[PDB]
Amino acid sequence: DQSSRYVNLALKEEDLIAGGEHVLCAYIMKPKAGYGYVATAAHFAAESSTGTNVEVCTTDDFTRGVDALVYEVDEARELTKIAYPVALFDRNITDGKAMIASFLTLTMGNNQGMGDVEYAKMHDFYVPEAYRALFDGPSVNISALWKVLGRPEVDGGLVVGTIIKPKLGLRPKPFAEACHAFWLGGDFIKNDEPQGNQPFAPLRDTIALVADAMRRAQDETGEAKLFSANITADDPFEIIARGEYVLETFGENASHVALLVDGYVAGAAAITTARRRFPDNFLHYHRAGHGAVTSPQSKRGYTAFVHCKMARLQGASGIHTGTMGFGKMEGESSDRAIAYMLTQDEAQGPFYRQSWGGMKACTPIISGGMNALRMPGFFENLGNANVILTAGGGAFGHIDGPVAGARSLRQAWQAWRDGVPVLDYAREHKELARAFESFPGDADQIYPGWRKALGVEDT
Amino acid sequence: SDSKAIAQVGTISANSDETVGKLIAEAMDKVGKEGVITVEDGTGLQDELDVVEGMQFDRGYLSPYFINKPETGAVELESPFILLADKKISNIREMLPVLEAVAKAGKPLLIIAEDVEGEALATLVVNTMRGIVKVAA
Amino acid sequence: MNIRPLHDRVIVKRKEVETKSAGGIVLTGSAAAKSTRGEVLAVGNGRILENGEVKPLDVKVGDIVIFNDGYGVKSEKIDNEEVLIMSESDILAIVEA
Amino acid sequence: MNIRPLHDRVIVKRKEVETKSAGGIVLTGSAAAKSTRGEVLAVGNGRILENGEVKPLDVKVGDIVIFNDGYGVKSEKIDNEEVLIMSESDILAIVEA
Amino acid sequence: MNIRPLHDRVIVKRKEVETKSAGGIVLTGSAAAKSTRGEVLAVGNGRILENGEVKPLDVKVGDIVIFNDGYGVKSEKIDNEEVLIMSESDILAIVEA
């Protein structure tokens, strides 16, 4: 609460950014009607730090060091830019890197319990150039997934994954078999957001059965694959139990494990917990209930830009970003722009220009899904592919469904990275021949005349 | 070694209850020297002894439609063949020659397998319901 | 209504699908199988190519044939029946005898 | 059933698979290997292209051949046997003796 | 066995691989190199295109040739030796004399 001292527009963005004095968050914030905007933005900064509610004391009144401050505010453009003391984000004991539970607590969570903020969508932020290397940070990410997959640590591109067909009600071993089938296809999978310990398919049997399915699928394909276990729980120690179990369950492939956290329903405590004991494993942020915040049905909480840019901060090795081809506008929360922001360590956001030395990359995770042929178009717009797919029939309406199409759209990048695009690897890889054959909805126009060079009779 | 002497050491260790002495002396006889005895909480006021003979294990029918004795709520097959698949069953492709051969023999079949997926299970359900082959999985 | 395929087109109907007598015995469930076999319903005037005279296609109405049921094969609703439209090349073989 | 391929088409059946005598001695397990060799069952009347006369195909029934087992080759069920159907261009060479 | 490649096809065997005398002296390790040079074992009857007469292929048995050891060549097992099959267009030149 309070606006006094919390208005500090005299703070220079240069020393805050380049001097690294503060974490700097740009909010598109609108108050409720009749509230003073600058007071609301400053009052929102108090919720974004110390709280300071009714009264603060230390046996002798006052408290004045913890405050995150507004440093640019402008009512008519709905802009609220808040600068956060680096002391707000207390260092995790596992690595000395700041607990992202604080950051969410101070941006899109307990601080959003402020009611006279109608919404405060953060469109961008900055994190101090040096101390950034001591943000929670994704000690595993796409780059380490590349390493366990045997890809080069630079531009190992698309780690292909799916939302298992037909989504809910698929029992653990049919689900594991759908994972096996998919892993006769591609590379990566998650549990669904209800597929925790919920009785239709609990985690332990599913992850045991899914892990077997992964080893079977690996043995039957000669290439490594990955699963994201839904560790999301109401008890952080049950989350740890799910995380430990999946690592112990995959065992010789424990480094293959991903940790699906439905971070919005799980909270950043669950995210921070799933990053803690599991630094050598892929924290998969997922977006249960996100219609309350990121979707256009709401203006509150995160934009998809900061949603995933903070997934970098989270040490969420990846995050459900939305859909890879993003409409209307770019830079402003485009998944394509996010894929830069997460996978290239030098990028411009809609309010801040930032580097990402020392803290490492983050992985965009794609729902809905481009076909295997449109994705080299996204790759050509992204100039890389360093993302994860996690989609259904949009990418996996292949003639082999989730299977061969999921190999195909990995190799679709590899051809793009060779500067040949996907045409060449569809000549090389049968799954991509079947993918041009499966996706004429884009295939016959996004990458020209495959039909004569690719395949034989009727492709 | 005699039943009476064992019933005493039972009674004494039970703190002087003849009922357990008799009960344990009975159990030791019926299960044989290699048999195994266990104890668990009952429900009625009386103690009770359940003896299981042959082989038993804690797995049921994979579908209710296999119930061929709905008055009992149970499955029974007589003179069945037994197929032991150390695998998933996923496709009837896998089953066709076996089911034909069992269909050739006309005897019912029990399937004990790692799992029987919906496609195979549904196909067995149709063929068992329509009486082409008696099958349980 | 009769229909005239306008050269190289052939009109057919598929035989029965998922024949319920696999191996002659087991009443198979659905497996998304589709028969590659059909009956020739209409045949085009011939082949227009090479500026030669329009030579006829070798199949005739009432032929039973094996055809590649690929995406290039279209299908249409006529008299509420389903029918299939294809080139001669899409037919693989004739079911003789 | 006998079948007549409708020009340029050729039909074969595959030889034995995963012959259990690697080096003539060791009984191989499965390695997902498949034989590229088969016996010619029927041959089309000839080649229709270029306005020329329908010249015959060079293989004949009872030939044993090496073929490119690529996506152009389709497969079909006849007499409950499997059979394979291909262009002449998918046959690579003829195996004598 | 003898084999006749069926028009435009040519059969070759590769020359020796990874000659152990780099600069004639240094024994190269395995360096993924494969000889573009092989000896022609059999040559097809000719080329059938364009309705001309079947002119023969320009290579003959016992020619030693540089070939594109690329995606076009295919390979088969015969008399337990390996051999390669390619179009004439795979062969880039005859190293003569």
Side-chain angles (χ1 to χ4, degrees), chain A residues 1-458, chain B, chain C, chain D, chain E:
Chain A
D1 293 336
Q2 308 185 356
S3 304
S4 305
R5 69 174 171 193
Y6 290 112
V7 182
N8 202 349
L9 315 187
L11 294 173
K12 277 76 69 177
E13 187 152 53
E14 306 308 324
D15 63 355
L16 271 43
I17 298 181
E21 292 293 351
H22 289 262
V23 166
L24 259 59
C25 299
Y27 298 86
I28 294 300
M29 189 287 290
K30 185 144 64 195
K32 280 184 165 55
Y35 287 93
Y37 185 104
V38 171
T40 303
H43 186 316
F44 181 59
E47 269 83 2
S48 304
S49 52
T50 314
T52 303
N53 309 104
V54 183
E55 178 74 25
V56 290
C57 188
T58 176
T59 303
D60 194 11
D61 213 329
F62 305 102
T63 285
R64 60 168 306 182
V66 176
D67 62 358
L69 278 299
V70 292
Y71 72 99
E72 171 170 23
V73 178
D74 197 337
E75 315 93 6
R77 56 166 147 153
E78 303 173 11
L79 185 61
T80 293
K81 287 167 57 181
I82 295 165
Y84 295 61
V86 164
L88 282 165
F89 323 104
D90 194 12
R91 308 313 188 259
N92 295 290
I93 66 174
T94 52
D95 45 49
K97 309 199 192 298
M99 65 182 179
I100 205 73
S102 170
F103 181 94
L104 186 151
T105 295
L106 304 181
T107 56
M108 318 290 177
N110 309 63
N111 73 313
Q112 303 268 336
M114 184 176 171
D116 48 323
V117 164
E118 176 57 13
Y119 60 76
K121 234 173 188 174
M122 192 185 295
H123 274 240
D124 205 359
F125 65 79
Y126 167 84
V127 296
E129 185 62 31
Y131 155 75
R132 174 182 75 217
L134 306 97
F135 261 93
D136 191 358
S139 54
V140 168
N141 59 77
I142 194 80
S143 300
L145 265 54
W146 296 341
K147 195 264 289 178
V148 302
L149 294 171
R151 299 180 196 187
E153 301 93 333
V154 178
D155 299 339
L158 180 48
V159 171
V160 180
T162 192
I163 285 168
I164 283 289
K165 187 175 180 178
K167 209 186 162 60
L168 280 294
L170 191 65
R171 279 275 165 202
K173 215 163 186 167
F175 180 96
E177 209 77 5
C179 296
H180 183 181
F182 171 80
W183 286 317
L184 299 182
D187 318 310
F188 183 92
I189 313 173
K190 68 168 194 68
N191 283 135
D192 273 10
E193 46 200 337
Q195 199 196 28
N197 192 0
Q198 283 78 352
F200 74 91
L203 191 141
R204 281 74 177 177
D205 50 5
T206 304
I207 288 300
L209 292 174
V210 163
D212 178 52
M214 202 180 81
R215 290 299 292 95
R216 281 148 42 190
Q218 287 178 172
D219 298 343
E220 292 166 34
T221 53
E223 45 164 1
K225 286 150 212 300
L226 315 166
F227 195 84
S228 195
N230 198 342
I231 58 163
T232 310
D234 299 342
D235 291 3
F237 297 106
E238 196 273 331
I239 305 186
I240 292 296
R242 293 171 184 196
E244 185 75 65
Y245 178 87
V246 61
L247 298 195
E248 289 185 328
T249 298
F250 278 89
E252 64 175 34
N253 286 185
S255 61
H256 296 208
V257 172
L259 264 62
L260 184 81
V261 187
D262 308 316
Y264 185 66
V265 302
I271 297 292
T272 304
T273 297
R275 173 53 187 72
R276 274 288 75 69
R277 183 262 172 269
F278 315 97
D280 300 336
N281 279 103
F282 185 101
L283 191 156
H284 180 167
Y285 184 105
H286 182 44
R287 57 165 50 202
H290 74 285
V293 292
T294 57
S295 301
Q297 293 79 6
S298 178
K299 298 287 290 190
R300 279 176 147 259
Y302 289 109
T303 51
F305 210 77
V306 172
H307 197 202
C308 309
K309 194 179 164 151
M310 89 157 286
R312 189 196 285 275
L313 307 187
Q314 285 169 13
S317 307
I319 175 158
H320 274 266
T321 301
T323 193
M324 79 187 269
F326 201 96
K328 193 178 67 177
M329 190 173 185
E330 301 216 57
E332 293 283 20
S333 196
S334 162
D335 198 321
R336 297 174 186 268
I338 290 160
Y340 283 98
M341 183 59 60
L342 311 197
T343 74
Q344 183 176 288
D345 295 334
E346 179 58 47
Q348 177 74 61
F351 295 92
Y352 305 102
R353 198 294 313 160
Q354 173 61 311
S355 309
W356 302 110
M359 189 182 73
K360 304 189 179 184
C362 176
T363 318
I365 304 174
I366 304 308
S367 78
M370 289 174 71
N371 52 73
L373 278 299
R374 267 281 168 199
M375 292 180 182
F378 160 82
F379 304 153
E380 182 65 1
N381 282 270
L382 175 55
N384 78 9
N386 304 351
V387 305
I388 279 167
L389 183 65
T390 293
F396 302 124
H398 192 261
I399 72 169
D400 301 315
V403 189
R407 290 197 314 264
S408 69
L409 66 90
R410 187 207 309 143
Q411 295 144 4
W413 188 62
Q414 299 168 243
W416 175 88
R417 163 266 282 167
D418 288 352
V420 297
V422 56
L423 306 84
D424 287 6
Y425 282 58
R427 269 168 283 98
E428 295 182 37
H429 300 85
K430 181 267 288 180
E431 51 263 40
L432 264 180
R434 314 294 62 82
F436 273 95
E437 172 178 355
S438 66
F439 309 125
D442 292 283
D444 198 15
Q445 64 274 12
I446 211 65
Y447 279 106
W450 61 272
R451 295 185 189 260
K452 186 174 288 181
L454 177 61
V456 182
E457 179 155 18
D458 213 357
Chain B
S1 59
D2 186 87
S3 306
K4 187 179 181 182
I6 182 171
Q8 286 85 71
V9 58
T11 299
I12 298 305
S13 180
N15 197 347
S16 67
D17 183 73
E18 70 82 19
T19 318
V20 296
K22 169 58 47 174
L23 193 72
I24 293 280
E26 288 293 328
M28 211 85 88
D29 190 74
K30 291 178 71 170
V31 300
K33 292 182 180 180
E34 69 277 19
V36 170
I37 309 172
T38 61
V39 300
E40 67 179 31
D41 61 357
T43 60
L45 280 298
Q46 305 85 352
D47 300 323
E48 294 85 3
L49 169 62
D50 183 308
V51 179
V52 168
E53 162 65 15
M55 186 164 182
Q56 175 50 39
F57 62 92
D58 302 341
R59 298 288 181 267
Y61 45 79
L62 273 167
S63 85
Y65 295 166
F66 301 143
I67 292 294
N68 65 348
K69 294 318 173 316
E71 313 93 323
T72 311
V75 182
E76 178 163 39
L77 309 172
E78 298 190 332
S79 307
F81 288 111
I82 298 89
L83 182 65
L84 304 179
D86 186 22
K87 294 300 286 174
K88 271 257 182 174
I89 291 160
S90 285
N91 298 115
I92 279 288
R93 314 316 186 169
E94 304 322 325
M95 304 303 99
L96 291 173
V98 190
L99 294 174
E100 289 164 31
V102 167
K104 271 311 162 298
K107 284 176 173 174
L109 182 64
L110 180 63
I111 303 298
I112 313 181
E114 299 271 42
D115 183 74
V116 184
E117 301 201 303
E119 176 196 306
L121 189 75
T123 57
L124 293 176
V125 166
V126 65
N127 284 270
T128 55
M129 282 178 72
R130 297 284 75 78
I132 300 102
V133 189
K134 293 183 290 294
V135 190
Chain C
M1 188 167 283
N2 80 5
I3 196 77
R4 264 291 311 121
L6 61 77
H7 69 260
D8 64 358
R9 281 72 167 78
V10 179
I11 309 313
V12 305
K13 271 186 62 41
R14 195 187 285 108
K15 264 62 152 175
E16 192 298 335
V17 173
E18 296 277 30
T19 300
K20 204 43 175 201
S21 302
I25 300 178
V26 66
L27 321 182
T28 183
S30 306
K34 189 64 68 68
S35 182
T36 182
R37 296 90 191 279
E39 179 34 78
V40 178
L41 289 174
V43 182
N45 50 67
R47 180 159 94 207
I48 299 299
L49 296 177
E50 67 275 9
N51 197 34
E53 59 75 21
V54 184
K55 76 181 70 69
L57 294 64
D58 63 355
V59 297
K60 63 175 61 70
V61 179
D63 289 344
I64 296 89
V65 299
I66 295 89
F67 68 93
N68 179 250
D69 197 356
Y71 167 89
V73 185
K74 311 308 178 189
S75 179
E76 199 70 343
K77 193 66 146 175
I78 294 95
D79 303 342
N80 290 318
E81 301 91 32
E82 190 277 329
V83 297
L84 292 174
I85 306 97
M86 70 291 291
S87 74
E88 69 275 16
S89 309
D90 304 319
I91 297 89
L92 296 176
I94 186 70
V95 186
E96 300 196 336
Chain D
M1 195 81 75
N2 80 358
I3 194 67
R4 68 172 178 271
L6 73 165
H7 73 260
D8 283 291
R9 284 75 164 78
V10 180
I11 190 173
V12 305
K13 62 182 293 181
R14 194 185 158 177
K15 296 191 73 181
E16 294 83 3
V17 175
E18 292 280 29
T19 304
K20 293 87 180 178
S21 304
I25 62 171
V26 58
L27 311 190
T28 188
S30 180
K34 66 188 286 285
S35 181
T36 55
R37 302 93 187 272
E39 186 265 337
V40 181
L41 299 178
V43 184
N45 45 5
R47 181 69 179 271
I48 58 184
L49 283 71
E50 55 79 14
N51 194 12
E53 177 272 3
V54 181
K55 69 184 69 63
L57 297 177
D58 282 354
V59 300
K60 64 174 64 71
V61 178
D63 289 344
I64 295 177
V65 301
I66 194 57
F67 70 112
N68 180 243
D69 61 358
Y71 309 158
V73 76
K74 311 307 180 185
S75 181
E76 67 280 16
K77 193 67 153 173
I78 294 95
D79 305 346
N80 265 357
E81 302 185 52
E82 195 65 27
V83 179
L84 279 296
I85 198 72
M86 70 292 291
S87 74
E88 191 194 44
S89 307
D90 294 328
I91 300 93
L92 280 170
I94 187 67
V95 187
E96 301 199 325
Chain E
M1 173 76 74
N2 80 1
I3 193 79
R4 64 177 63 88
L6 61 81
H7 71 257
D8 287 311
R9 325 317 319 149
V10 297
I11 308 182
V12 71
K13 61 186 293 177
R14 70 186 59 259
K15 296 194 73 176
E16 61 86 20
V17 173
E18 294 281 29
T19 301
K20 200 61 42 176
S21 301
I25 77 182
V26 178
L27 62 84
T28 186
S30 296
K34 302 290 286 288
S35 185
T36 66
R37 282 78 185 273
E39 186 72 1
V40 61
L41 298 179
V43 186
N45 64 7
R47 67 178 294 276
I48 303 304
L49 288 73
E50 55 79 16
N51 197 29
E53 71 76 19
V54 185
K55 73 181 74 71
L57 308 183
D58 281 3
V59 60
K60 67 178 68 71
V61 179
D63 290 345
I64 187 74
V65 303
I66 190 167
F67 72 98
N68 295 278
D69 207 11
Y71 185 70
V73 69
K74 303 295 154 296
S75 305
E76 66 293 14
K77 191 65 147 180
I78 179 63
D79 71 5
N80 66 12
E81 192 275 331
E82 185 62 27
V83 296
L84 297 175
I85 57 172
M86 71 291 291
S87 78
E88 68 277 14
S89 64
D90 186 74
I91 302 86
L92 291 175
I94 197 64
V95 61
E96 69 278 16

